[PDB]
């Protein structure tokens, strides 16, 4: 039993296996999957991302060296630089996601053993219904993004079909759109790893509330098998394990998350800018305007997908703080349970469960307020000049 | 005795009952009101807000589809978009306030039972004089806003009366102004709920100071019935209850408060902008200038109404920290009271009483400095171009 | 012995007594001064500030109603509004400083009794040499500002002497410059109150370090009369007293400090703007350029005078944290001194000594980085247009 | 044995000895160096920096008083002011670095005695391989900067060689480039001092993890000689020593670091601005464009060199918090080790190991996000006008 991963977390692991973001061998256990590092899939991922990056660079050069008037996607020198920056940052995100995948998956197994131990101590992580709901949500997001990407590709190819270069744009941007798909699959993978960890933290909070209830294999499906004195110690150990796992996830996904946030800034500055520039000046294009609106919505959705599970984890930490306070008010004053609650309070004060990619920022809802605050500041400056 | 609400908090609950923001059945108890969820008032609120939103959308379309020169309120394409955004955000705020009211009122009763228990343990929340003062302040704010709304409506109707469409503007903006009234009634409701909770927290701090005084049904109107050892434990339990209630209030009002803050940003950017544009270019209109000044003052007052009770609650938390420190310096060093104060200090360090709508920001005076700091930055950029 | 104030804190109290910012009766005790609230000086302060504000408003109207070309200080419509805002904010600062002085002085005596108790327990606050140095620094700052104000008045009067209105400018701006003097005297008063409190906190830290040294009326001029067990408790009580006094000072000076910070923002935005506008376009005036440079330096010095004592107090708090950590590493592990250090650590964690005017901001060096960061942002925007 | 410094920290001390930033006498001990303050080197440093500053001021005047068209480096009035500000801030940084060096080196010895004690208690700080790696990295950075400086000097001299003033630019900028070298050597010196301290902190964390492992001269190369009860107390004392040393380093380097951060802001605003201005308008110069790109990269590298060791120290503090939490979950509950861990937790909560130059800001990765956030805001404003 090396890893024994399952649920919606293992669904995105199989999906990202083909994208190169999870080079694992999936052994079905009729309930979950036992995943191990495979060198064949690692080599496949490396060669796939290298080929895609080479093709993307070649297409960027071919769309830059053609000129300005002849190119369809790029129509100005400023548009050439910003589109080149977009392509380069997307390629960098994909390269960080795929090249760093085998190390990330090794870390994943390394903390998944402890996650398996914690789940055994608590009992399950999700019900079947909510696991199916999460899988359906992941599939809906992935299919929506894939449909938008295909529509954008088809629109930009048909627009170039009037000139005659209907295949040149395809050759220049197939790798770019594959890299887009890889980047969003990586975003979904991080989001669902964080969501599974947050579910485990929620179960830990439920166990604390249960040992508060004093009904009387710590948790069963409620009641409490062990006395509250040792249950609190076991829960403190499990919370330290969860903190270690959250730190491991943040370390594994820090660089991709930072580059994704930078890409989100760039896109939320650029796509609304050209969307507005195509409104006030002259629309003349329903499909382009609809695509730009959908791309703005998709960038906002990607930022939300990145941020929201981290906010939920922080909220679960606040909830366990509240539960611990309610515990400390109760319980015999001089008893041994009170000192266990004191130790748990010291643990809660010393370390908290949060996501800080590379330490530059804290993934939470206040971060997206700063992002949208900066985006509007640049947009107000940029738009008012034209 | 389901809820037994009373005072200035129950005054805004009866006022917001007709606006649809509090679908409760008010049973007078000759001292307070026993409020329960009523399905008839819930349906009335839902149909009222739906009708108002439909009428507002129809009026927005009719004032947009008429043109630019013919419309009185909107005189440019840029003015059409910003006024449409204003109407849409006000309608969204009203819809969130009214559609989410029955859940908010259920939460209100759910923590009001604990508030009743806490008030019974402490004794009262306000005197009659200060309750009358708070009711008078609420009535003054509501009447000032209603007078300003009526004056704005009358001015914009009489201005359109020259052209001949004296009734078209009325039909297009009656729903909008009703939604304005609903939004400010919701703001007042949140503010006075927070004020009542802050009064309870202030009474808790007074009880801590009394158990410090060591004079010797915890609090009476001073002295202390129970010994300070158990009084501190009961006060710790009551503070945890107050923290839970504050969290419930923040959860109930988070989305409306966030949208209200966004509307405050938009209005403090737009209304001063047009006020200045009507000053430097040409005034020619005393009534319009006075109305714009009054609207800027009203937006600032609304932001203050939102923020200020939260700042007072935070100040009460700081005060209880200071009282606890003064307690810990006193009291026998090795006694059981010292350990109770240790537990209370751990509670104070672990959790604090604050308002964080949706977790995006903390409602406090520093927040309004950031708001006014951003408002001036946009205004300096926007004004200097013209 | 009502108050018994002395030193550089009582030097600015006698200076601000005539400005109306300290309506106290100074009874010399041959070592210090026993100050009490006097109704005669309160009435004198009220009538003086009312007369000065009335004269300032009259002069502002007379310099606005004259026109644009004829007025010397104001040469444009934009210059009329910004100079009017400057005069109004200075008058508001002076009115808040003088009208709120009697309450501020009552609070001053109320915490000065506890300061006297603390000084008796510790022993002195400053040596004679450093008290003379602080008095000399205060006198140097006051004389520098007075010389700059007199030079500015003389320059603006002589410039208007060419036209013939050599006395109209004097009549219109005498009250304004008196209000300037009052505002800076208030700034100096707050700064030196904070400096005296910081000196007391530094002596408290020295006493903690001494009880760490374990040499063996707590502090003498070193050694320790009482055993370290009770010395730490007495020091904890004294630190709570110092925290209460700092909170009282912040409450007394919050509104004046907030308005002073707003004035500092406005002046650091406006004076450099016109200084640059008089450089790139055409200088033609050495005296005006020198005066503008000196006024920029004076505004920076005023901001530093406001911020710096608060930063020193925060640094003293950090120092006492470090001293407490060093104490906790030492001392017998299971002894009673260890538990006293535990209580002191809980005090240090629960509350800290800081200045937060009205709760909107924290007076510290990071605040002035935000101020200068915002000032340059507006200056970069404003200057680049011309 | 006065100091006994060695490793990569003593490599930059010998390099900065000639630049005047470390006036020490290096006595080889066949393993390390025993460094003492030398008055001869102090006088040499003072006269060297004074001569360089005088020459820099003379060259700035000669390049300003020549005019605009004739000067090669400066081609406009705006370019004259910004280049003068660059030269002045670099000269101020060099003067603060060299004039304050003897005090900084005295502080260095004062905490290096305690560092020697801590290293004796723990055992070593770096292996030979990693010390050689750090020396190689320092040499690579220094040689890269020296090559860039020499190339910039040669390019600007050859550009002026067409006119005929091939030696005037050399005479005017030799002192400026020497000051550049001094400033970056000071940056490297601070960075490597911080890196050595961070290595010691990492060894302290390793010792805590070892006393967690419970294998059983505290640390040996693993196992633990002393029982965990007293090992934790000795580690707490060592952590307080490390905190004192970090505070001493921050105090010594605060002003140079603040001026370096200001210079980084100025350069990251100015060099990209002219780099873009030389791209959109007309390039016509490959060497100038390459030099501007390299200078932008060098400014970013200098900011990273300043910030990164501080971020690593903060990360080590977070790691010791996590290790302490894991310790507190383990260990007998009522034993004496638990109370030692309680004291260590109080130490960790009261004080943390961080770098705050002058208290204005905290050196960490979030700081460089604010720096780059402000840099782009000014660049977006400035670039869009042209």
Author numbering:
A (entry chain B), B (entry chain C), C (entry chain D), D (entry chain A): 14 to 229, 271 to 275, 281 to 445
What is the paper's account of this structure, in its own sentences?
Insects, instead, rely on a distinct family of sweet gustatory receptors, which are tetrameric ligand-gated cation channels. An extreme example of sugar specialization occurs in a conserved subfamily of gustatory receptors founded by Drosophila melanogaster Gr43a (DmGr43a), whose members are selectively activated only by the monosaccharide d-fructose, providing a unique opportunity to investigate how specificity for a single sugar is achieved. Here we investigate the structural basis of sugar discrimination by Gr9 (BmGr9), the silk moth B. mori orthologue of DmGr43a. Our results thus indicate that receptor tuning in BmGr9 arises from two distinct but complementary mechanisms: the stereoelectronic characteristics of the ligand-binding pocket; and the engagement of an allosteric process required to activate the channel.
To gain insight into the mechanism of receptor activation, we also determined the structure of BmGr9 in the absence of ligand. We resolved a map of similar quality as the fructose-bound BmGr9 but with the extracellular hydrophobic gate closed, consistent with the absence of any density in the ligand-binding pocket. In the unbound structure, Phe444 side chains from each subunit face the centre of the ion-conducting pore, erecting a hydrophobic barrier that constricts the pore diameter and prevents ion passage, similar to the gate observed in olfactory receptors. In the closed state, Gln443 hydrogen bonds with Gln445 from a neighbouring subunit. In the absence of a ligand, the vestibule connecting the pocket to the extracellular surface is approximately 8 Å wide, large enough for sugar molecules to access the bottom of the pocket freely. In the closed state, Tyr332 and Phe333 are exposed to the membrane interior through a gap between the S7b and S2 helices, where additional columnar lipid or detergent density is observed in the structure of unbound BmGr9. Nearby, Arg90 in S2 reaches across the gap between subunits to interact with carboxy-terminal carbonyls of S5 in the absence of ligand.
